[PDB]
Amino acid sequence: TVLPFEAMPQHPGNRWLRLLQIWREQGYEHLHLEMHQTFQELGPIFRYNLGGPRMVCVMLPEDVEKLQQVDSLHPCRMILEPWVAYRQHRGHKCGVFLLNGPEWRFNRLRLNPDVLSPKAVQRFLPMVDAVARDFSQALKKKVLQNARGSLTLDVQPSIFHYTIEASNLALFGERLGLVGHSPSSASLNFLHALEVMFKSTVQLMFMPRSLSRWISPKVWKEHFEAWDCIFQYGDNCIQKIYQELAFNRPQHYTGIVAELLLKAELSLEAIKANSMELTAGSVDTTAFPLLMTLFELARNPDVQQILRQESLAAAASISEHPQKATTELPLLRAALKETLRLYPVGLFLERVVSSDLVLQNYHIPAGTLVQVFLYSLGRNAALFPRPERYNPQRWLDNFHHVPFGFGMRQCLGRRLAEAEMLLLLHHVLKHFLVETLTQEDIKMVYSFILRPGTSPLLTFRAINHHHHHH
Amino acid sequence: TVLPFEAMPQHPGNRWLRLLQIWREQGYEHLHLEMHQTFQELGPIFRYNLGGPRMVCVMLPEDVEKLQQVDSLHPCRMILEPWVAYRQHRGHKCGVFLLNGPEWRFNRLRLNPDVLSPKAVQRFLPMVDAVARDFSQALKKKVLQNARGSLTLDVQPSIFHYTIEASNLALFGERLGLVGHSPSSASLNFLHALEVMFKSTVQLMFMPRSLSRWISPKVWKEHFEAWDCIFQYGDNCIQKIYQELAFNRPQHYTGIVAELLLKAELSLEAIKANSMELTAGSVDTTAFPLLMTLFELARNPDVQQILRQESLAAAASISEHPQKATTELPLLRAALKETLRLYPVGLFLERVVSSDLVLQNYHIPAGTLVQVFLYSLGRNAALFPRPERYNPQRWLDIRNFHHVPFGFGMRQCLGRRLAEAEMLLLLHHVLKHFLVETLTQEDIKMVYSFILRPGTSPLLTFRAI
Ligand code: HEM
Ligand code: HEM
Ligand SMILES: N#Cc1ccc([C@H]2CCCc3cncn32)cc1
Ligand SMILES: N#Cc1ccc([C@H]2CCCc3cncn32)cc1
């Protein structure tokens, strides 16, 4: 006795009122708070009167599980129009982020061994580790200059450059000295273009191209300029590795995009496509969780001390083999789960479902956009007693951690992001105390990704008073 | 056995695509055509989705009849928000065109006697007649200066200036010097302001102020600025007459607005709002049909003769007694009806219906906005056999509800008789002196900017007979 779809509670909003609001305010920064309010009012599930087709909103781990079982051989998420529009506009391919069906599987099966797999991690992680080391050392050099052995800064810029750097090293095998040196104009341009892309994504996202073409011509013009810039940044990288490997096939490991070029299992343009997604994808999605993690430790000193204690003890064996940072810092790994529980950069998981299923005892038809809202999911008091508490212990005691998604589609950059975040935190922790007066909740803001709206003024205080030694 | 509301056919599109359409287009110039191929395609009645509120579009006399039968004691047209908002902005009252309820009735009842009465019509018809005599007289001077004894021009300018001159005389007893001379900057400003006011109205009309406010704030600047020019024109007129009456009450007839001022049944403020409506309302609505009529006569020389023959035959007693023109030119009175059938100035009739009723075996809830759509109505080839035929004879036996281009009930156009007199009188004098021709045989594209209007001025030749 399952309830018919038509009998599911309904988000009260006109698709058109949202759209005009996006037109007026040039964005939709509270999306997540609204959604959250909506589950709060209506409960675990609801449907949204969309532009015609059925779409449903869920927030329970149970629902993710079922969603995973219904994953075909080709799971589907929605065609993000403005992004694809650009690719077809310049005649490019699309990486796994923008693909569906046979083309997606083909690519993903050829990217898993070299981006995601555990044998890939083990080659690229010591490279990340070196970048992570330079971050702290450089931050320590600046810290010890100060009479008080501390520095108080907005760490956002430098975190964003750490991830431009750690990533570009792992990906391409070049250091672009953006750690312990000022931003370049090339890196500042890139960052800005990525911001413009997301903002202009949100403006064009909520309406068909046929209509947005004539009511927002210059949003489109903005979006393509931003991409043109993101693409110039990423094609410059491609050109350099590509010419280099034309003349010398290395004996040793020189990064992820080198494996893909060597192994030649993918066409040049298919590699170009997937390189871009990795260069663009590796920056913001990693930086905000680091930032938010830095904030949570800063304002939970007792948890900070615990994570340090663990990192101080594993110090010696991690500088011996940096690869042991995965298995030896499980509290730190847990802290990340916790940061992403509260601050889920990917706001929601998306499936355009290909077979009737049952969620929450309602019946879901073939082609329903099911959408899993990870903000409300993370804050469910029933599943996460005291959700407002940052308590990484919570995780040590299943589908509760799913911020990278699930199944075969699960984030290709998961382990790179994980390594990058984990390793930076490890070195910061053994070297510095992290502090703030700014102990009130940071207001998160939606522009395609869920990001902090402000940056807290953080303090890094040296524990030792030495440049190398913790 | 009565089908309930939502059983009715549904206009394809939505208010939102409409808004945005209008935003980018800056207009809705095809509304009449768009509504027409909706009647063609869906039937003689349909609903339009306002997402909650209730609208019905109808095209048949049969239905108009029932609409009237359900006029209240206070028949309602909808609040025309932009126009009313201007009255709020500047602190003036509303006239009869924008009122509803007891305030409407109180105004209208004190308005008909001097604006619409047959008795009124006798007092001002000879004034109108003077101006239309000056029109042909002037046209004739120019025509005879030419070797072929004819002049080919675009008359739209001089026609508009005619209706300004004739309204001003009828309304204020004042005679501007516009007929047979040059447009003054005031009149030109005035015609511009009016046409911008219509333009801007369409741009704000189809969305609530809560949207137009931020979507189209320049269009609001544009709308009010147009009205400021319109209120400057009429208030100048009011001011003049107010002063002359404070000083001397005349023993004789000197205009419509004088009779209102001398009676003082209505308040000064109320007299002002109505006088303004009559001044703005007596220009584009009269002038466009009068042009369309000239075009159709040029297009149908054999209808032009019949009419010319009637006017020459009635010339003498009309010259001697102007007032008789209402009764001695029945074919010319029919031609007006004919023009208004094919070219209805006010595109739709309108009632926010007070009681329940049934139209076309559909149930229509109280509070519903029922619109009659006259362009379709008059083009109903099943009701007017050979509908694109200009045939004045069509109207020689009057049933009534085939001719509703001024509306119906207590609400029917207050300016109706002044309108008909002006158009009647001009054509009469033009017919006795000139033949009217064009090579332009092809239909003229109507355009919708709040009123339905030609989008082109056909080039006309006038030849002295
Ligand atoms: C903590 C940071 C990150 C989070 C929270 C995250 C999360 C996600 C999520 C939720 C999805 C959708 C998964 C699904 O539909 O099952 C996804 C897809 C994807 N992400 Fe990430 N990601 C992160 C970092 C990265 C990085 C650094 C990269 C690139 C180096 C990356 C590249 C991708 C790609 C290529 C896809 C498409 C995968 C596919 O469709 O197979 N992500 N990610
Ligand atoms: C060919 C000439 C005209 C046409 C086709 C026309 C059309 C109309 C229509 C269709 C209505 C609506 C009545 C209703 O909804 O029941 C109306 C009302 C009105 N008209 Fe005209 N009109 C014309 C000339 C004029 C003139 C010259 C004036 C000014 C002297 C004028 C002033 C008004 C006013 C004040 C109303 C409001 C009546 C009320 O609600 O009581 N009209 N007209
Ligand atoms: N091209 C491209 C591209 C740019 C940014 C991303 C980021 C931002 C969107 C959500 C997400 C999950 N994993 C990575 N990402 C992903 C792809
Ligand atoms: N104020 C004013 C005002 C200005 C123009 C008009 C015109 C044009 C709109 C429909 C109509 C019916 N009778 C006259 N009119 C009516 C009122």
PDB file of C-alpha atoms in Angstrom, chain B residues 90-324:
ATOM      1  CA  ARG B  90      -0.513  63.922  -7.983  1.00  0.00           C
ATOM      2  CA  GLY B  91      -3.490  64.034  -5.604  1.00  0.00           C
ATOM      3  CA  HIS B  92      -6.357  64.356  -8.115  1.00  0.00           C
ATOM      4  CA  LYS B  93      -9.690  62.544  -8.112  1.00  0.00           C
ATOM      5  CA  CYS B  94     -10.798  59.886 -10.600  1.00  0.00           C
ATOM      6  CA  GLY B  95     -13.267  60.477 -13.387  1.00  0.00           C
ATOM      7  CA  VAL B  96     -15.963  58.173 -14.632  1.00  0.00           C
ATOM      8  CA  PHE B  97     -13.606  56.002 -16.809  1.00  0.00           C
ATOM      9  CA  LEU B  98     -11.633  54.813 -13.735  1.00  0.00           C
ATOM     10  CA  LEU B  99     -14.295  54.848 -11.039  1.00  0.00           C
ATOM     11  CA  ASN B 100     -16.314  51.887  -9.760  1.00  0.00           C
ATOM     12  CA  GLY B 101     -19.113  51.684  -7.205  1.00  0.00           C
ATOM     13  CA  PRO B 102     -21.332  54.464  -5.804  1.00  0.00           C
ATOM     14  CA  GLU B 103     -18.649  57.067  -6.619  1.00  0.00           C
ATOM     15  CA  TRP B 104     -18.913  56.048 -10.283  1.00  0.00           C
ATOM     16  CA  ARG B 105     -22.710  56.260 -10.313  1.00  0.00           C
ATOM     17  CA  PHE B 106     -22.749  59.555  -8.500  1.00  0.00           C
ATOM     18  CA  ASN B 107     -20.387  60.989 -11.142  1.00  0.00           C
ATOM     19  CA  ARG B 108     -22.016  59.356 -14.179  1.00  0.00           C
ATOM     20  CA  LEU B 109     -25.547  60.446 -13.229  1.00  0.00           C
ATOM     21  CA  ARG B 110     -24.406  64.061 -13.021  1.00  0.00           C
ATOM     22  CA  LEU B 111     -22.475  63.687 -16.294  1.00  0.00           C
ATOM     23  CA  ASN B 112     -24.936  62.255 -18.907  1.00  0.00           C
ATOM     24  CA  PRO B 113     -27.335  65.138 -19.046  1.00  0.00           C
ATOM     25  CA  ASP B 114     -24.717  67.611 -20.393  1.00  0.00           C
ATOM     26  CA  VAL B 115     -22.336  65.172 -22.103  1.00  0.00           C
ATOM     27  CA  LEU B 116     -24.641  62.558 -23.674  1.00  0.00           C
ATOM     28  CA  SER B 117     -28.280  63.838 -23.737  1.00  0.00           C
ATOM     29  CA  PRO B 118     -30.005  64.382 -27.083  1.00  0.00           C
ATOM     30  CA  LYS B 119     -30.715  67.805 -25.565  1.00  0.00           C
ATOM     31  CA  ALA B 120     -27.008  68.356 -25.017  1.00  0.00           C
ATOM     32  CA  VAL B 121     -26.299  67.152 -28.579  1.00  0.00           C
ATOM     33  CA  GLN B 122     -28.554  69.904 -30.048  1.00  0.00           C
ATOM     34  CA  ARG B 123     -26.693  72.616 -28.170  1.00  0.00           C
ATOM     35  CA  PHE B 124     -23.170  71.563 -29.259  1.00  0.00           C
ATOM     36  CA  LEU B 125     -23.775  69.998 -32.693  1.00  0.00           C
ATOM     37  CA  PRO B 126     -23.726  73.361 -34.400  1.00  0.00           C
ATOM     38  CA  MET B 127     -20.382  74.139 -32.760  1.00  0.00           C
ATOM     39  CA  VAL B 128     -18.947  70.909 -34.116  1.00  0.00           C
ATOM     40  CA  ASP B 129     -20.489  71.801 -37.522  1.00  0.00           C
ATOM     41  CA  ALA B 130     -18.635  75.114 -37.629  1.00  0.00           C
ATOM     42  CA  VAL B 131     -15.304  73.312 -37.265  1.00  0.00           C
ATOM     43  CA  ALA B 132     -15.996  70.696 -39.873  1.00  0.00           C
ATOM     44  CA  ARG B 133     -17.081  73.440 -42.264  1.00  0.00           C
ATOM     45  CA  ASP B 134     -13.749  75.124 -41.624  1.00  0.00           C
ATOM     46  CA  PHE B 135     -12.021  71.796 -42.333  1.00  0.00           C
ATOM     47  CA  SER B 136     -13.355  71.283 -45.896  1.00  0.00           C
ATOM     48  CA  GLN B 137     -13.202  74.989 -46.592  1.00  0.00           C
ATOM     49  CA  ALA B 138      -9.469  74.921 -45.766  1.00  0.00           C
ATOM     50  CA  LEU B 139      -8.881  71.696 -47.658  1.00  0.00           C
ATOM     51  CA  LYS B 140     -10.677  73.215 -50.632  1.00  0.00           C
ATOM     52  CA  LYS B 141      -8.468  76.361 -50.779  1.00  0.00           C
ATOM     53  CA  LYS B 142      -5.443  74.110 -51.107  1.00  0.00           C
ATOM     54  CA  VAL B 143      -7.057  71.676 -53.510  1.00  0.00           C
ATOM     55  CA  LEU B 144      -8.053  74.373 -55.999  1.00  0.00           C
ATOM     56  CA  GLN B 145      -4.567  75.892 -55.998  1.00  0.00           C
ATOM     57  CA  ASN B 146      -3.464  72.750 -57.875  1.00  0.00           C
ATOM     58  CA  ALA B 147      -3.860  72.327 -61.652  1.00  0.00           C
ATOM     59  CA  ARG B 148      -5.546  68.913 -61.427  1.00  0.00           C
ATOM     60  CA  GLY B 149      -7.908  70.456 -58.838  1.00  0.00           C
ATOM     61  CA  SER B 150      -6.925  67.896 -56.197  1.00  0.00           C
ATOM     62  CA  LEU B 151      -4.464  67.325 -53.335  1.00  0.00           C
ATOM     63  CA  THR B 152      -2.895  64.057 -52.300  1.00  0.00           C
ATOM     64  CA  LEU B 153      -1.652  63.993 -48.766  1.00  0.00           C
ATOM     65  CA  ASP B 154      -1.477  61.997 -45.630  1.00  0.00           C
ATOM     66  CA  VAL B 155      -4.465  63.472 -43.680  1.00  0.00           C
ATOM     67  CA  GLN B 156      -3.683  61.904 -40.320  1.00  0.00           C
ATOM     68  CA  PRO B 157      -2.162  65.174 -38.928  1.00  0.00           C
ATOM     69  CA  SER B 158      -5.084  67.425 -40.001  1.00  0.00           C
ATOM     70  CA  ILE B 159      -7.636  64.822 -38.834  1.00  0.00           C
ATOM     71  CA  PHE B 160      -6.152  64.676 -35.372  1.00  0.00           C
ATOM     72  CA  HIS B 161      -6.028  68.424 -35.168  1.00  0.00           C
ATOM     73  CA  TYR B 162      -9.640  68.445 -36.251  1.00  0.00           C
ATOM     74  CA  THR B 163     -10.748  66.281 -33.355  1.00  0.00           C
ATOM     75  CA  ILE B 164      -8.761  68.473 -30.930  1.00  0.00           C
ATOM     76  CA  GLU B 165     -10.433  71.578 -32.383  1.00  0.00           C
ATOM     77  CA  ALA B 166     -13.913  70.125 -32.352  1.00  0.00           C
ATOM     78  CA  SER B 167     -13.660  68.659 -28.819  1.00  0.00           C
ATOM     79  CA  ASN B 168     -12.232  71.889 -27.482  1.00  0.00           C
ATOM     80  CA  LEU B 169     -15.160  73.809 -28.955  1.00  0.00           C
ATOM     81  CA  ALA B 170     -17.851  71.350 -27.725  1.00  0.00           C
ATOM     82  CA  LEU B 171     -16.139  71.026 -24.323  1.00  0.00           C
ATOM     83  CA  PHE B 172     -14.870  74.528 -23.433  1.00  0.00           C
ATOM     84  CA  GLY B 173     -16.502  76.824 -25.976  1.00  0.00           C
ATOM     85  CA  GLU B 174     -12.966  77.831 -26.792  1.00  0.00           C
ATOM     86  CA  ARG B 175     -11.736  77.792 -30.362  1.00  0.00           C
ATOM     87  CA  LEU B 176      -8.060  76.997 -30.781  1.00  0.00           C
ATOM     88  CA  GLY B 177      -6.728  78.056 -34.184  1.00  0.00           C
ATOM     89  CA  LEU B 178      -5.753  74.562 -35.354  1.00  0.00           C
ATOM     90  CA  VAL B 179      -8.159  73.771 -38.220  1.00  0.00           C
ATOM     91  CA  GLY B 180      -6.864  75.315 -41.466  1.00  0.00           C
ATOM     92  CA  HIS B 181      -3.551  76.438 -39.962  1.00  0.00           C
ATOM     93  CA  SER B 182      -0.478  74.821 -38.464  1.00  0.00           C
ATOM     94  CA  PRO B 183      -0.231  72.526 -35.442  1.00  0.00           C
ATOM     95  CA  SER B 184       0.952  74.478 -32.432  1.00  0.00           C
ATOM     96  CA  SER B 185       3.683  73.112 -30.213  1.00  0.00           C
ATOM     97  CA  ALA B 186       1.022  72.489 -27.515  1.00  0.00           C
ATOM     98  CA  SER B 187      -1.155  70.249 -29.664  1.00  0.00           C
ATOM     99  CA  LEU B 188       1.922  68.400 -31.013  1.00  0.00           C
ATOM    100  CA  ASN B 189       3.229  67.894 -27.460  1.00  0.00           C
ATOM    101  CA  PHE B 190      -0.279  66.795 -26.565  1.00  0.00           C
ATOM    102  CA  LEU B 191      -0.512  64.169 -29.363  1.00  0.00           C
ATOM    103  CA  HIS B 192       2.957  62.891 -28.483  1.00  0.00           C
ATOM    104  CA  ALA B 193       2.223  62.661 -24.772  1.00  0.00           C
ATOM    105  CA  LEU B 194      -1.024  60.778 -25.495  1.00  0.00           C
ATOM    106  CA  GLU B 195       0.621  58.154 -27.729  1.00  0.00           C
ATOM    107  CA  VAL B 196       3.419  57.633 -25.195  1.00  0.00           C
ATOM    108  CA  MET B 197       0.823  57.279 -22.461  1.00  0.00           C
ATOM    109  CA  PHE B 198      -0.807  54.460 -24.456  1.00  0.00           C
ATOM    110  CA  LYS B 199       2.561  52.866 -25.259  1.00  0.00           C
ATOM    111  CA  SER B 200       3.664  52.916 -21.605  1.00  0.00           C
ATOM    112  CA  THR B 201       0.237  51.669 -20.424  1.00  0.00           C
ATOM    113  CA  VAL B 202       0.636  48.364 -22.270  1.00  0.00           C
ATOM    114  CA  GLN B 203       4.088  47.999 -20.692  1.00  0.00           C
ATOM    115  CA  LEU B 204       2.723  48.186 -17.121  1.00  0.00           C
ATOM    116  CA  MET B 205      -0.872  46.945 -17.491  1.00  0.00           C
ATOM    117  CA  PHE B 206      -0.055  43.247 -17.821  1.00  0.00           C
ATOM    118  CA  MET B 207       1.909  42.953 -14.563  1.00  0.00           C
ATOM    119  CA  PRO B 208       1.323  43.888 -10.901  1.00  0.00           C
ATOM    120  CA  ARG B 209       3.081  47.056  -9.619  1.00  0.00           C
ATOM    121  CA  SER B 210       5.146  44.761  -7.337  1.00  0.00           C
ATOM    122  CA  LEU B 211       6.866  43.584 -10.537  1.00  0.00           C
ATOM    123  CA  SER B 212       6.803  46.576 -12.949  1.00  0.00           C
ATOM    124  CA  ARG B 213       8.300  48.615 -10.089  1.00  0.00           C
ATOM    125  CA  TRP B 214      11.730  46.960 -10.434  1.00  0.00           C
ATOM    126  CA  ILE B 215      11.378  45.335 -13.839  1.00  0.00           C
ATOM    127  CA  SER B 216      10.377  48.544 -15.614  1.00  0.00           C
ATOM    128  CA  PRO B 217      11.021  51.632 -13.514  1.00  0.00           C
ATOM    129  CA  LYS B 218      11.852  53.857 -16.531  1.00  0.00           C
ATOM    130  CA  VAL B 219       8.528  52.855 -18.066  1.00  0.00           C
ATOM    131  CA  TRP B 220       6.887  54.260 -14.901  1.00  0.00           C
ATOM    132  CA  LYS B 221       8.963  57.482 -15.343  1.00  0.00           C
ATOM    133  CA  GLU B 222       7.786  57.501 -18.980  1.00  0.00           C
ATOM    134  CA  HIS B 223       4.089  56.873 -18.073  1.00  0.00           C
ATOM    135  CA  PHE B 224       3.800  59.650 -15.460  1.00  0.00           C
ATOM    136  CA  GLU B 225       5.736  62.153 -17.532  1.00  0.00           C
ATOM    137  CA  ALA B 226       3.323  61.618 -20.389  1.00  0.00           C
ATOM    138  CA  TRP B 227       0.426  62.219 -18.000  1.00  0.00           C
ATOM    139  CA  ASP B 228       2.098  65.382 -16.601  1.00  0.00           C
ATOM    140  CA  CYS B 229       1.993  66.752 -20.161  1.00  0.00           C
ATOM    141  CA  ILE B 230      -1.604  65.551 -20.625  1.00  0.00           C
ATOM    142  CA  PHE B 231      -2.673  67.157 -17.310  1.00  0.00           C
ATOM    143  CA  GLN B 232      -0.878  70.368 -18.197  1.00  0.00           C
ATOM    144  CA  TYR B 233      -2.896  70.593 -21.451  1.00  0.00           C
ATOM    145  CA  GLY B 234      -6.360  70.103 -19.953  1.00  0.00           C
ATOM    146  CA  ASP B 235      -5.737  72.005 -16.715  1.00  0.00           C
ATOM    147  CA  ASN B 236      -4.770  75.012 -18.821  1.00  0.00           C
ATOM    148  CA  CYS B 237      -8.245  74.725 -20.399  1.00  0.00           C
ATOM    149  CA  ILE B 238      -9.999  74.238 -17.099  1.00  0.00           C
ATOM    150  CA  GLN B 239      -8.151  77.257 -15.611  1.00  0.00           C
ATOM    151  CA  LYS B 240      -9.278  79.473 -18.514  1.00  0.00           C
ATOM    152  CA  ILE B 241     -12.971  78.649 -18.274  1.00  0.00           C
ATOM    153  CA  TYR B 242     -13.011  78.663 -14.476  1.00  0.00           C
ATOM    154  CA  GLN B 243     -11.965  82.261 -14.453  1.00  0.00           C
ATOM    155  CA  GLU B 244     -14.336  83.440 -17.138  1.00  0.00           C
ATOM    156  CA  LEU B 245     -17.321  81.965 -15.245  1.00  0.00           C
ATOM    157  CA  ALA B 246     -16.333  83.318 -11.843  1.00  0.00           C
ATOM    158  CA  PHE B 247     -16.645  86.716 -13.583  1.00  0.00           C
ATOM    159  CA  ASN B 248     -19.606  86.221 -15.906  1.00  0.00           C
ATOM    160  CA  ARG B 249     -22.253  83.498 -16.213  1.00  0.00           C
ATOM    161  CA  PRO B 250     -23.431  83.560 -19.847  1.00  0.00           C
ATOM    162  CA  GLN B 251     -27.131  83.694 -20.909  1.00  0.00           C
ATOM    163  CA  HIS B 252     -26.444  81.245 -23.733  1.00  0.00           C
ATOM    164  CA  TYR B 253     -24.741  77.940 -24.606  1.00  0.00           C
ATOM    165  CA  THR B 254     -20.918  77.927 -24.353  1.00  0.00           C
ATOM    166  CA  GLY B 255     -19.862  74.271 -23.944  1.00  0.00           C
ATOM    167  CA  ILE B 256     -20.229  71.018 -22.030  1.00  0.00           C
ATOM    168  CA  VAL B 257     -17.802  71.906 -19.236  1.00  0.00           C
ATOM    169  CA  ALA B 258     -19.609  75.214 -18.604  1.00  0.00           C
ATOM    170  CA  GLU B 259     -22.923  73.452 -17.913  1.00  0.00           C
ATOM    171  CA  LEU B 260     -21.046  71.296 -15.346  1.00  0.00           C
ATOM    172  CA  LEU B 261     -19.459  74.340 -13.766  1.00  0.00           C
ATOM    173  CA  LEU B 262     -22.681  76.360 -13.691  1.00  0.00           C
ATOM    174  CA  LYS B 263     -24.694  73.502 -12.078  1.00  0.00           C
ATOM    175  CA  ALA B 264     -22.119  72.641  -9.340  1.00  0.00           C
ATOM    176  CA  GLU B 265     -23.831  69.317  -8.695  1.00  0.00           C
ATOM    177  CA  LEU B 266     -20.279  67.882  -8.878  1.00  0.00           C
ATOM    178  CA  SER B 267     -17.317  69.087  -6.807  1.00  0.00           C
ATOM    179  CA  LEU B 268     -14.636  71.271  -8.415  1.00  0.00           C
ATOM    180  CA  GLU B 269     -12.157  68.454  -8.018  1.00  0.00           C
ATOM    181  CA  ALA B 270     -14.641  65.976  -9.562  1.00  0.00           C
ATOM    182  CA  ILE B 271     -15.521  68.305 -12.420  1.00  0.00           C
ATOM    183  CA  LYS B 272     -11.744  68.473 -13.040  1.00  0.00           C
ATOM    184  CA  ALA B 273     -11.096  64.727 -13.260  1.00  0.00           C
ATOM    185  CA  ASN B 274     -14.005  64.234 -15.693  1.00  0.00           C
ATOM    186  CA  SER B 275     -13.122  67.263 -17.858  1.00  0.00           C
ATOM    187  CA  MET B 276      -9.611  65.815 -18.086  1.00  0.00           C
ATOM    188  CA  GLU B 277     -10.923  62.417 -19.197  1.00  0.00           C
ATOM    189  CA  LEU B 278     -13.066  64.120 -21.818  1.00  0.00           C
ATOM    190  CA  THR B 279     -10.107  66.132 -23.107  1.00  0.00           C
ATOM    191  CA  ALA B 280      -7.711  63.231 -23.301  1.00  0.00           C
ATOM    192  CA  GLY B 281     -10.499  60.913 -24.372  1.00  0.00           C
ATOM    193  CA  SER B 282     -11.720  62.827 -27.338  1.00  0.00           C
ATOM    194  CA  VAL B 283      -8.663  62.724 -29.613  1.00  0.00           C
ATOM    195  CA  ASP B 284      -7.235  59.327 -30.700  1.00  0.00           C
ATOM    196  CA  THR B 285     -10.583  57.470 -30.300  1.00  0.00           C
ATOM    197  CA  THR B 286     -12.468  59.764 -32.668  1.00  0.00           C
ATOM    198  CA  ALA B 287      -9.582  60.399 -35.129  1.00  0.00           C
ATOM    199  CA  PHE B 288      -8.637  56.826 -35.897  1.00  0.00           C
ATOM    200  CA  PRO B 289     -12.082  55.599 -37.026  1.00  0.00           C
ATOM    201  CA  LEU B 290     -12.604  58.815 -39.004  1.00  0.00           C
ATOM    202  CA  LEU B 291      -9.393  57.968 -40.884  1.00  0.00           C
ATOM    203  CA  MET B 292     -10.388  54.323 -41.375  1.00  0.00           C
ATOM    204  CA  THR B 293     -13.713  55.605 -42.761  1.00  0.00           C
ATOM    205  CA  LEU B 294     -11.926  57.810 -45.269  1.00  0.00           C
ATOM    206  CA  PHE B 295      -9.794  54.811 -46.280  1.00  0.00           C
ATOM    207  CA  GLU B 296     -12.824  52.571 -46.778  1.00  0.00           C
ATOM    208  CA  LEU B 297     -14.621  55.217 -48.838  1.00  0.00           C
ATOM    209  CA  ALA B 298     -11.537  55.498 -51.016  1.00  0.00           C
ATOM    210  CA  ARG B 299     -11.565  51.715 -51.253  1.00  0.00           C
ATOM    211  CA  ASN B 300     -15.258  51.522 -52.110  1.00  0.00           C
ATOM    212  CA  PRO B 301     -16.119  54.336 -54.523  1.00  0.00           C
ATOM    213  CA  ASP B 302     -19.562  52.862 -55.046  1.00  0.00           C
ATOM    214  CA  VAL B 303     -20.297  53.127 -51.335  1.00  0.00           C
ATOM    215  CA  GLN B 304     -18.769  56.587 -51.504  1.00  0.00           C
ATOM    216  CA  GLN B 305     -21.314  57.730 -54.139  1.00  0.00           C
ATOM    217  CA  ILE B 306     -24.375  56.440 -52.277  1.00  0.00           C
ATOM    218  CA  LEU B 307     -23.120  58.432 -49.274  1.00  0.00           C
ATOM    219  CA  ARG B 308     -22.106  61.509 -51.266  1.00  0.00           C
ATOM    220  CA  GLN B 309     -25.561  61.443 -52.860  1.00  0.00           C
ATOM    221  CA  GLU B 310     -27.248  61.332 -49.476  1.00  0.00           C
ATOM    222  CA  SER B 311     -25.276  64.338 -48.210  1.00  0.00           C
ATOM    223  CA  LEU B 312     -25.765  66.563 -51.257  1.00  0.00           C
ATOM    224  CA  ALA B 313     -29.466  65.627 -50.949  1.00  0.00           C
ATOM    225  CA  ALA B 314     -29.473  66.754 -47.315  1.00  0.00           C
ATOM    226  CA  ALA B 315     -27.035  69.690 -47.594  1.00  0.00           C
ATOM    227  CA  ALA B 316     -29.515  72.583 -47.586  1.00  0.00           C
ATOM    228  CA  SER B 317     -31.529  71.663 -44.450  1.00  0.00           C
ATOM    229  CA  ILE B 318     -28.324  70.720 -42.636  1.00  0.00           C
ATOM    230  CA  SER B 319     -26.675  74.044 -43.444  1.00  0.00           C
ATOM    231  CA  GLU B 320     -29.848  75.825 -42.321  1.00  0.00           C
ATOM    232  CA  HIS B 321     -30.397  73.560 -39.291  1.00  0.00           C
ATOM    233  CA  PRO B 322     -27.157  71.917 -38.240  1.00  0.00           C
ATOM    234  CA  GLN B 323     -28.872  69.817 -35.561  1.00  0.00           C
ATOM    235  CA  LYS B 324     -30.832  67.824 -38.110  1.00  0.00           C
TER     236      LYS B 324
END
